[PDB]
Amino acid sequence: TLSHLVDVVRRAHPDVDLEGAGVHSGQFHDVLIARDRVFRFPKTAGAAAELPGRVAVLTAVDAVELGVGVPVPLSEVRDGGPHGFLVLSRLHGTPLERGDATSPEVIDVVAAEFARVLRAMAGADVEKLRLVLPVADAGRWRGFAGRVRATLFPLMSEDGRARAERELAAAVAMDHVATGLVHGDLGGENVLWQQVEELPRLTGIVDWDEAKVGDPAEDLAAVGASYGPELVERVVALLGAGDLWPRIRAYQGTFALQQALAGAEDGDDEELEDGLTAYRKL
């Protein structure tokens, strides 16, 4: 009832222009994206706990001091609207197009921007983080394999299932690592850049929903999926993370299956179809 929500925002934030404002909507919550501010409004009394959740994650991440922006609660959580609301900062900047990230005159700068964030994430106080964030579970990939075999294997060719079993197996084989902050979805769309005196600067990281105490290889895998091995090799060279390659490849070989399984679970037909194209001939 976006009319109500808009009135809730006008009343609580008079100077917010909702003319030409984003709307993300869901079964879960509505989000009004204004110029400098995001308003999140849960739809259920149970979804309401997401608001202190988001505050606690973003506060914990901000306390690590990554040297780049993350969304900041601009308000306390409020018990106005139907089930509460939270006002977060909007970060400025644009994902780096893959062609731009990799030009010879910027690729070293892009590599160090990723490295300095990933290094601050790897040096987080994990004893503090583990009180707030999810912690990588040793069972995670066994369970994911189980759901992939139940939901997706029937839609695959026999070659699909053989390929998927080897990809699931490389993830199930990994020993449990929980040694720093992990974003969990560190693809290009969640990383925001600005041209700062004619060179890229990494100014913001958004979408901390998958954030955890975990394996730094999982964020390097996502950087590689967005930007290719030329970039991730340079990032890994700078971090001295050459040991992580087997883990990096095991995360990356699960990405199409993660997308397929989420397409099935979320009811996004295009995500399901797109994640499965390697696993069948039709």
Binding site: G187, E189, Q259, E271
Partner: peptide
């Protein structure tokens, strides 16, 4: 969504 993970 999406191939990164989403």
């Amino acid at each position: 969504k999406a191939x990164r993970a989403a």
